Amino acid sequence: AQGLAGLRNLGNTCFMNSILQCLSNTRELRDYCLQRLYMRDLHHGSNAHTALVEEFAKLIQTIWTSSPNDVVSPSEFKTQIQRYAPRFVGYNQQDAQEFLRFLLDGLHNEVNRVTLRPKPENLDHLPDDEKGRQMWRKYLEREDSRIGDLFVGQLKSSLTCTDCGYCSTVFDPFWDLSLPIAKEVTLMDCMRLFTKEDVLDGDEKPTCCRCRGRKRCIKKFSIQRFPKILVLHLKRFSESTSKLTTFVNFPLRDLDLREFASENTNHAVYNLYAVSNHSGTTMGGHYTAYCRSPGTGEWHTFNDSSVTPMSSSQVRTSDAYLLFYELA
Amino acid sequence: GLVPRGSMQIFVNTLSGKHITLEVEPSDTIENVKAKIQDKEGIPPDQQRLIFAGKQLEDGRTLSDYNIQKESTLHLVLRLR
Ligand SMILES: [Cl-]
Ligand SMILES: [Cl-]
Ligand SMILES: [Zn+2]
């Protein structure tokens, strides 16, 4: 059985181990490391302070050449991430999604195909979809890597003035989506709440450029481009600060997001392959991961040193915090 | 009269998924932005994280640094630790 290596907790590093295992079981990312394809994308060598990709890839390699029950130490990798992002220095518990964003940012920057990022425009003459495509091309002139190939999508935000009827549109790239907890509550309810028409009034009235006054506007998201790997981050934060422990019912296969698409499409169906779990209180809690092996299709719990089998029926729990979906 | 509103508006997707509208300048810092969110949401700046185009926005940078333009959405999240 391949890739079933545990990771040693170095002191409150279960957040790190959870995310590493989610990435380890991200098929195309894993292969990028195993086939050493990053070597062609790095433009120069590293030193002791800049070997993030190198140490990440070696860790993935070690996990996927281990025997089952092997425990691997990610100390050298941790040294590299904390040098890139000093917030990870030391041994406090950290948020898994914060770690995810910093790690992928560093991996991406190091293998960016753009080596000299170039230094906007009025696109109102264009139809929505053509403008979207122009904005996407502009983004790729600055950010273009094999890591981006996997995780990057494009949100369309539509802002309609209820007075003059002008709908203003912007296209924001995204590497993940942080979804509100809606309303048992389903993952589809959360995505519906994310994308719902939001009435902006009172202290939230935007200024409409046409009316040149504060106006009640309606803002609505749709997805202009769907990423190969969809990372969904559940906003488990309640107002009255403390953790929202609501059971969110997410599907293991056939997450169909065609309804949230900007245009009619067919390539918006996802299968789950990993989950980052947080159990316990807002402070002093603990991270594990459930991951589907890309080779066998079987699920395992990865809890630091301990890797154990589980049924797919045990994957869905109220501790699910990050969901890793792949295009079907 | 009143102090001027910011030259540019951006949105924040808050914890419940409702959006708020912020009055800003390209030269406003992420700290400035977090203070504005504190004003609207009651969340201390040191608990806030803001994501835009996959980047967590960092104190010491400005909105212009991240090419954040008018009507962009910043995504507000906190922490589980
Ligand atoms: Cl669902
Ligand atoms: Cl910061
Ligand atoms: Zn108007």
Short mmCIF file of C-alpha atoms and ligand atoms in Angstrom, two decimals:
data_model
loop_
_atom_site.label_atom_id
_atom_site.label_comp_id
_atom_site.label_asym_id
_atom_site.label_seq_id
_atom_site.Cartn_x
_atom_site.Cartn_y
_atom_site.Cartn_z
CA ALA A 1 0.00 0.00 0.00
CA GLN A 2 1.47 3.28 -1.18
CA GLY A 3 1.70 6.75 0.41
CA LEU A 4 0.40 5.73 3.81
CA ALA A 5 3.19 7.31 5.83
CA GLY A 6 2.48 9.21 9.02
CA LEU A 7 3.97 12.60 9.87
CA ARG A 8 5.51 13.37 13.25
CA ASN A 9 3.97 16.19 15.22
CA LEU A 10 6.79 18.65 15.97
CA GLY A 11 4.79 20.55 18.60
CA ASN A 12 1.29 21.75 17.68
CA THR A 13 1.99 20.96 14.00
CA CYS A 14 -1.09 18.82 13.30
CA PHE A 15 -2.43 21.76 11.17
CA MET A 16 0.63 21.34 8.95
CA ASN A 17 0.43 17.53 8.77
CA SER A 18 -3.28 17.66 7.91
CA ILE A 19 -2.69 20.00 4.94
CA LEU A 20 0.47 18.13 3.79
CA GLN A 21 -1.52 14.90 3.58
CA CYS A 22 -4.30 16.69 1.67
CA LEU A 23 -1.63 17.89 -0.83
CA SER A 24 0.14 14.49 -0.83
CA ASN A 25 -3.12 12.99 -2.09
CA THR A 26 -3.73 15.76 -4.62
CA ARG A 27 -2.93 13.52 -7.63
CA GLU A 28 -1.50 15.98 -10.18
CA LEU A 29 0.42 17.90 -7.48
CA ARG A 30 1.89 14.72 -6.05
CA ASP A 31 2.97 13.60 -9.55
CA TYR A 32 4.49 17.02 -10.24
CA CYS A 33 6.79 16.29 -7.25
CA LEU A 34 7.41 12.56 -7.87
CA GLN A 35 8.36 13.13 -11.54
CA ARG A 36 10.56 16.10 -10.40
CA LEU A 37 8.85 18.34 -13.00
CA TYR A 38 9.38 21.41 -10.75
CA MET A 39 13.09 21.25 -11.67
CA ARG A 40 12.30 22.59 -15.16
CA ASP A 41 10.12 25.38 -13.65
CA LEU A 42 12.68 26.67 -11.13
CA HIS A 43 14.73 29.39 -12.80
CA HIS A 44 17.76 29.18 -10.47
CA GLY A 45 19.12 27.21 -7.49
CA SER A 46 18.12 27.69 -3.88
CA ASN A 47 20.00 28.40 -0.67
CA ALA A 48 19.14 27.49 2.96
CA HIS A 49 16.52 30.26 3.11
CA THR A 50 14.71 29.60 -0.19
CA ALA A 51 14.37 25.80 -0.63
CA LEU A 52 10.55 25.60 -0.15
CA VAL A 53 9.71 23.70 -3.39
CA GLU A 54 12.78 21.48 -2.98
CA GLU A 55 11.87 20.43 0.59
CA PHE A 56 8.12 20.14 -0.13
CA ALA A 57 8.84 17.83 -3.11
CA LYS A 58 11.34 15.72 -1.11
CA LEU A 59 8.70 15.25 1.64
CA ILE A 60 6.10 14.12 -0.92
CA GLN A 61 8.72 11.77 -2.43
CA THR A 62 9.48 10.32 1.00
CA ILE A 63 5.79 9.72 1.76
CA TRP A 64 5.30 7.94 -1.59
CA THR A 65 8.37 5.67 -1.23
CA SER A 66 7.61 4.72 2.36
CA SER A 67 6.41 1.33 3.68
CA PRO A 68 3.07 1.37 5.55
CA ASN A 69 3.34 2.46 9.22
CA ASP A 70 6.51 4.46 8.43
CA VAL A 71 6.56 7.77 10.33
CA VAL A 72 8.23 10.67 8.47
CA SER A 73 9.61 13.88 10.00
CA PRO A 74 8.73 17.11 8.21
CA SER A 75 11.26 19.21 10.21
CA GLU A 76 13.25 20.33 7.15
CA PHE A 77 10.09 21.36 5.32
CA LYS A 78 8.84 23.24 8.38
CA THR A 79 12.14 25.15 8.51
CA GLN A 80 11.57 26.24 4.87
CA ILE A 81 7.90 27.34 5.24
CA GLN A 82 8.68 29.41 8.36
CA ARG A 83 11.58 31.09 6.53
CA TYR A 84 9.18 32.01 3.70
CA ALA A 85 6.36 32.93 6.10
CA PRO A 86 7.68 33.89 9.58
CA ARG A 87 4.23 33.46 11.20
CA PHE A 88 4.96 29.69 11.28
CA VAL A 89 8.14 30.03 13.36
CA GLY A 90 7.89 28.23 16.69
CA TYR A 91 5.37 25.76 18.00
CA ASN A 92 1.90 27.30 18.37
CA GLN A 93 -1.19 25.75 16.78
CA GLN A 94 -2.07 27.46 13.48
CA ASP A 95 -5.10 27.60 11.18
CA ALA A 96 -4.89 25.03 8.36
CA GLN A 97 -6.38 27.34 5.72
CA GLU A 98 -3.94 30.16 6.61
CA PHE A 99 -1.09 27.59 6.23
CA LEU A 100 -2.60 26.40 2.95
CA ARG A 101 -2.65 29.93 1.51
CA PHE A 102 0.94 30.77 2.49
CA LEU A 103 2.32 27.38 1.38
CA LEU A 104 0.73 27.48 -2.09
CA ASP A 105 1.70 31.12 -2.48
CA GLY A 106 5.40 30.26 -1.90
CA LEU A 107 5.29 27.14 -4.04
CA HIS A 108 3.64 29.14 -6.83
CA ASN A 109 6.04 32.12 -6.67
CA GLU A 110 9.08 29.79 -6.84
CA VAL A 111 7.78 27.99 -9.99
CA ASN A 112 6.01 30.99 -11.64
CA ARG A 113 6.57 30.90 -15.41
CA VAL A 114 6.40 34.69 -15.44
CA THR A 115 9.89 35.88 -14.43
CA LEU A 116 9.37 39.61 -14.92
CA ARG A 117 5.82 40.51 -13.87
CA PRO A 118 4.65 43.36 -16.17
CA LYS A 119 3.16 46.59 -14.75
CA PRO A 120 -5.60 48.89 -16.40
CA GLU A 121 -8.24 49.59 -19.09
CA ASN A 122 -11.87 50.30 -19.96
CA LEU A 123 -13.53 47.08 -21.13
CA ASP A 124 -17.18 48.25 -21.28
CA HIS A 125 -17.39 47.80 -25.06
CA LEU A 126 -16.86 44.04 -24.48
CA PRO A 127 -19.52 41.43 -23.72
CA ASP A 128 -19.26 39.89 -20.19
CA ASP A 129 -17.57 36.66 -21.23
CA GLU A 130 -15.01 38.39 -23.48
CA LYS A 131 -14.13 40.83 -20.67
CA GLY A 132 -13.78 37.84 -18.31
CA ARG A 133 -11.36 36.24 -20.79
CA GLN A 134 -9.32 39.45 -21.12
CA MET A 135 -9.08 39.75 -17.29
CA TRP A 136 -7.99 36.09 -17.13
CA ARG A 137 -5.23 36.69 -19.72
CA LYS A 138 -4.07 39.76 -17.73
CA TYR A 139 -3.91 37.68 -14.52
CA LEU A 140 -1.84 34.97 -16.29
CA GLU A 141 0.64 37.63 -17.51
CA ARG A 142 1.56 37.95 -13.83
CA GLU A 143 0.64 34.59 -12.27
CA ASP A 144 1.20 31.47 -14.34
CA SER A 145 2.44 28.19 -12.87
CA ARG A 146 1.65 24.46 -12.65
CA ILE A 147 0.32 25.04 -9.12
CA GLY A 148 -2.06 27.71 -10.57
CA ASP A 149 -3.05 25.28 -13.35
CA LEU A 150 -4.46 23.12 -10.54
CA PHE A 151 -6.07 25.52 -8.02
CA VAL A 152 -7.04 28.75 -9.84
CA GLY A 153 -10.58 29.75 -10.87
CA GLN A 154 -12.32 33.04 -11.63
CA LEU A 155 -15.29 34.59 -9.81
CA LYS A 156 -17.66 36.93 -11.61
CA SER A 157 -19.16 39.59 -9.34
CA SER A 158 -22.19 41.48 -10.67
CA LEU A 159 -23.22 44.79 -9.06
CA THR A 160 -26.60 46.19 -10.18
CA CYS A 161 -27.87 49.68 -9.28
CA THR A 162 -31.57 49.49 -8.45
CA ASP A 163 -32.01 53.07 -9.70
CA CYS A 164 -30.45 53.29 -13.22
CA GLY A 165 -30.15 49.52 -13.79
CA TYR A 166 -26.43 49.58 -14.64
CA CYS A 167 -24.81 46.22 -13.86
CA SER A 168 -21.12 46.63 -13.21
CA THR A 169 -19.00 43.44 -13.51
CA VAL A 170 -15.60 42.49 -12.13
CA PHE A 171 -13.68 39.21 -12.36
CA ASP A 172 -11.57 38.17 -9.31
CA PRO A 173 -9.20 35.16 -9.51
CA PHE A 174 -9.51 32.67 -6.62
CA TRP A 175 -7.44 29.71 -5.33
CA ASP A 176 -10.15 28.57 -2.94
CA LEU A 177 -13.63 29.57 -1.78
CA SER A 178 -14.51 30.36 1.82
CA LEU A 179 -18.18 29.52 2.12
CA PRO A 180 -20.70 30.82 4.65
CA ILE A 181 -22.60 28.28 6.74
CA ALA A 182 -26.24 28.55 5.60
CA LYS A 183 -29.65 27.57 7.06
CA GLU A 184 -29.75 19.37 7.79
CA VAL A 185 -27.59 22.07 6.08
CA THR A 186 -26.01 20.84 2.83
CA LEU A 187 -22.87 21.95 0.95
CA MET A 188 -25.19 23.08 -1.88
CA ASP A 189 -27.06 25.39 0.59
CA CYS A 190 -23.71 26.98 1.52
CA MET A 191 -22.80 27.57 -2.15
CA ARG A 192 -26.28 28.98 -2.77
CA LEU A 193 -25.80 31.43 0.14
CA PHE A 194 -22.32 32.36 -1.21
CA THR A 195 -23.77 33.13 -4.66
CA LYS A 196 -27.15 34.59 -3.59
CA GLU A 197 -28.24 38.11 -4.60
CA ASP A 198 -27.04 40.27 -1.74
CA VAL A 199 -29.02 43.49 -1.20
CA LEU A 200 -26.64 46.30 -0.29
CA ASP A 201 -28.55 49.10 1.49
CA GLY A 202 -28.37 51.38 4.56
CA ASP A 203 -24.73 51.72 5.66
CA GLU A 204 -23.68 49.31 2.86
CA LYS A 205 -25.06 51.37 -0.12
CA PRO A 206 -22.34 51.54 -2.76
CA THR A 207 -21.79 54.64 -4.88
CA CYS A 208 -23.07 54.04 -8.42
CA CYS A 209 -20.79 55.66 -11.04
CA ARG A 210 -23.75 56.53 -13.28
CA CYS A 211 -26.07 58.07 -10.70
CA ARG A 212 -23.08 59.57 -8.81
CA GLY A 213 -24.89 58.97 -5.50
CA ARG A 214 -25.23 56.25 -2.86
CA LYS A 215 -27.76 53.72 -4.20
CA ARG A 216 -29.27 50.41 -3.10
CA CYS A 217 -27.41 47.84 -5.22
CA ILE A 218 -27.62 44.11 -5.73
CA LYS A 219 -24.37 42.14 -5.73
CA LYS A 220 -24.31 38.46 -6.96
CA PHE A 221 -21.38 35.99 -7.60
CA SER A 222 -21.19 33.40 -10.32
CA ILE A 223 -18.21 31.20 -11.28
CA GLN A 224 -16.63 32.25 -14.58
CA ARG A 225 -13.88 29.56 -14.54
CA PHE A 226 -13.92 26.35 -12.49
CA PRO A 227 -10.53 25.08 -11.22
CA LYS A 228 -9.30 21.51 -11.62
CA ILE A 229 -8.93 21.34 -7.84
CA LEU A 230 -11.68 23.09 -5.86
CA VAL A 231 -10.78 23.85 -2.28
CA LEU A 232 -13.77 24.71 -0.15
CA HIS A 233 -13.18 26.34 3.21
CA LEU A 234 -16.14 26.38 5.59
CA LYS A 235 -16.47 29.57 7.61
CA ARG A 236 -16.91 27.93 11.04
CA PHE A 237 -16.93 31.25 12.86
CA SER A 238 -19.94 32.49 14.87
CA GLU A 239 -20.65 36.12 15.84
CA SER A 240 -22.20 35.85 19.36
CA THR A 241 -15.59 34.83 18.85
CA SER A 242 -16.24 31.08 18.79
CA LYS A 243 -16.45 28.03 16.53
CA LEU A 244 -19.57 27.16 14.50
CA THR A 245 -19.89 23.37 14.77
CA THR A 246 -22.83 22.89 12.36
CA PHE A 247 -22.98 19.57 10.49
CA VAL A 248 -22.53 20.42 6.81
CA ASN A 249 -23.65 17.62 4.56
CA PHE A 250 -21.19 17.42 1.67
CA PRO A 251 -21.22 14.75 -1.05
CA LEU A 252 -18.27 12.42 -1.69
CA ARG A 253 -18.99 12.31 -5.40
CA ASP A 254 -21.05 14.31 -7.85
CA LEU A 255 -20.83 17.79 -6.39
CA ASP A 256 -22.57 19.49 -9.31
CA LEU A 257 -21.97 23.24 -9.48
CA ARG A 258 -23.38 23.94 -12.94
CA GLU A 259 -26.15 26.14 -11.35
CA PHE A 260 -23.51 28.59 -10.07
CA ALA A 261 -21.77 28.87 -13.44
CA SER A 262 -21.71 32.21 -15.27
CA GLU A 263 -22.58 30.36 -18.51
CA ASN A 264 -24.16 26.98 -19.33
CA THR A 265 -21.47 24.32 -18.78
CA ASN A 266 -20.88 20.60 -18.14
CA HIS A 267 -17.42 20.65 -16.55
CA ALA A 268 -18.48 21.74 -13.07
CA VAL A 269 -18.93 18.32 -11.44
CA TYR A 270 -16.50 17.35 -8.63
CA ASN A 271 -15.49 14.33 -6.55
CA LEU A 272 -14.16 14.64 -3.01
CA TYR A 273 -10.65 13.32 -2.34
CA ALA A 274 -9.57 14.96 0.96
CA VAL A 275 -10.86 16.65 4.09
CA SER A 276 -9.03 18.67 6.71
CA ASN A 277 -10.79 18.19 10.07
CA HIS A 278 -10.62 20.49 13.11
CA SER A 279 -11.93 19.03 16.40
CA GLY A 280 -12.18 20.85 19.73
CA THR A 281 -12.49 24.52 20.69
CA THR A 282 -11.49 27.63 18.72
CA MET A 283 -8.17 27.52 20.66
CA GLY A 284 -6.59 24.23 21.74
CA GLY A 285 -8.25 22.07 19.09
CA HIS A 286 -6.71 19.42 16.87
CA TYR A 287 -6.36 18.66 13.14
CA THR A 288 -6.59 15.37 11.25
CA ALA A 289 -7.15 14.57 7.57
CA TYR A 290 -9.26 12.02 5.70
CA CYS A 291 -7.79 11.29 2.26
CA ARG A 292 -8.67 9.03 -0.66
CA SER A 293 -5.65 7.27 -2.07
CA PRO A 294 -5.43 8.25 -5.77
CA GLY A 295 -4.29 4.71 -6.70
CA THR A 296 -6.75 2.49 -4.77
CA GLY A 297 -9.74 4.77 -4.05
CA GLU A 298 -9.71 3.76 -0.38
CA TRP A 299 -9.92 6.27 2.46
CA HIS A 300 -7.53 6.64 5.40
CA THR A 301 -7.44 8.80 8.53
CA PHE A 302 -4.10 10.56 8.86
CA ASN A 303 -3.62 11.71 12.43
CA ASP A 304 -0.02 12.84 12.74
CA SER A 305 2.00 9.59 13.20
CA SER A 306 -1.00 7.27 12.87
CA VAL A 307 -2.47 6.26 9.48
CA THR A 308 -5.51 3.97 9.73
CA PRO A 309 -8.17 2.60 7.34
CA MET A 310 -11.70 3.94 7.37
CA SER A 311 -14.91 3.50 5.44
CA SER A 312 -16.02 6.22 3.04
CA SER A 313 -19.15 6.29 5.26
CA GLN A 314 -17.07 7.82 8.11
CA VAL A 315 -15.60 10.72 6.05
CA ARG A 316 -18.53 13.13 6.47
CA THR A 317 -18.47 14.70 9.95
CA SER A 318 -19.18 18.00 11.63
CA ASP A 319 -15.39 18.57 12.04
CA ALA A 320 -14.87 18.94 8.27
CA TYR A 321 -13.23 22.36 7.76
CA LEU A 322 -11.51 22.22 4.35
CA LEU A 323 -12.89 20.13 1.52
CA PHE A 324 -10.69 19.15 -1.44
CA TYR A 325 -12.64 18.44 -4.60
CA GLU A 326 -11.26 17.31 -8.00
CA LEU A 327 -13.03 17.65 -11.41
CA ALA A 328 -14.76 14.37 -12.33
CA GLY B 1 -19.95 69.23 5.77
CA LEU B 2 -18.28 65.86 6.31
CA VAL B 3 -14.88 64.27 5.64
CA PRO B 4 -14.92 62.79 2.11
CA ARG B 5 -15.86 59.15 1.53
CA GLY B 6 -13.04 57.04 -0.02
CA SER B 7 -12.44 57.40 -3.80
CA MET B 8 -12.94 53.68 -4.33
CA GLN B 9 -15.36 51.10 -2.95
CA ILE B 10 -14.58 47.43 -2.34
CA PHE B 11 -16.62 44.70 -0.68
CA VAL B 12 -15.95 42.32 2.15
CA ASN B 13 -17.63 38.94 2.30
CA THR B 14 -18.20 38.69 6.04
CA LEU B 15 -18.48 35.64 8.29
CA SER B 16 -22.18 35.01 7.51
CA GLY B 17 -21.63 35.60 3.79
CA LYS B 18 -23.31 39.01 3.78
CA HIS B 19 -21.24 41.70 2.06
CA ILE B 20 -20.24 45.03 3.48
CA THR B 21 -19.12 48.03 1.44
CA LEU B 22 -15.82 49.74 2.34
CA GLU B 23 -14.83 53.27 1.36
CA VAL B 24 -11.10 53.16 0.45
CA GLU B 25 -8.03 54.53 -1.36
CA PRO B 26 -5.53 52.39 -3.35
CA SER B 27 -2.95 53.60 -0.81
CA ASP B 28 -4.87 52.34 2.25
CA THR B 29 -2.95 49.67 4.20
CA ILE B 30 -4.32 46.26 5.09
CA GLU B 31 -4.30 47.53 8.75
CA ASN B 32 -6.53 50.46 7.70
CA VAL B 33 -8.81 47.93 5.98
CA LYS B 34 -8.98 45.68 9.06
CA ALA B 35 -9.89 48.76 11.21
CA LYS B 36 -12.75 49.48 8.80
CA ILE B 37 -13.95 45.88 9.19
CA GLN B 38 -13.66 46.23 12.96
CA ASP B 39 -15.91 49.33 12.66
CA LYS B 40 -18.57 47.40 10.71
CA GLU B 41 -18.34 43.89 12.13
CA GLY B 42 -17.00 44.27 15.67
CA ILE B 43 -14.17 41.79 14.99
CA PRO B 44 -10.73 42.67 16.43
CA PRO B 45 -8.15 43.32 13.71
CA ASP B 46 -5.77 40.71 15.19
CA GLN B 47 -8.31 37.93 14.51
CA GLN B 48 -9.11 38.94 10.92
CA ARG B 49 -7.70 37.26 7.81
CA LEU B 50 -8.43 38.64 4.35
CA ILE B 51 -8.06 36.62 1.17
CA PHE B 52 -7.94 38.07 -2.35
CA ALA B 53 -6.91 36.10 -5.42
CA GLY B 54 -5.50 33.36 -3.14
CA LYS B 55 -3.26 35.79 -1.19
CA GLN B 56 -3.76 36.48 2.50
CA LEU B 57 -3.34 40.24 2.71
CA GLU B 58 -0.48 41.30 4.98
CA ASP B 59 -0.14 44.28 7.34
CA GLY B 60 2.36 46.77 5.99
CA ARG B 61 1.09 46.46 2.41
CA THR B 62 -1.46 48.68 0.65
CA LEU B 63 -4.40 47.69 -1.57
CA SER B 64 -2.48 48.91 -4.67
CA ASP B 65 0.33 46.44 -3.84
CA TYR B 66 -2.12 43.61 -4.53
CA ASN B 67 -3.74 45.29 -7.61
CA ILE B 68 -7.07 45.39 -5.79
CA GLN B 69 -9.39 47.45 -7.99
CA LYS B 70 -12.89 48.95 -7.49
CA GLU B 71 -15.67 46.47 -6.55
CA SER B 72 -13.31 43.59 -5.81
CA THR B 73 -14.30 41.31 -2.93
CA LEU B 74 -12.05 40.54 0.01
CA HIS B 75 -12.94 37.30 1.82
CA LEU B 76 -13.00 37.58 5.62
CA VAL B 77 -12.16 34.45 7.65
CA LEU B 78 -10.88 33.89 11.21
CA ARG B 79 -8.91 30.99 12.73
CA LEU B 80 -9.33 27.51 14.14
CA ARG B 81 -6.37 26.61 16.34
CL CL C 1 -24.67 19.02 -1.14
CL CL C 2 -0.50 40.30 8.60
ZN ZN C 3 -27.24 53.99 -10.81
#
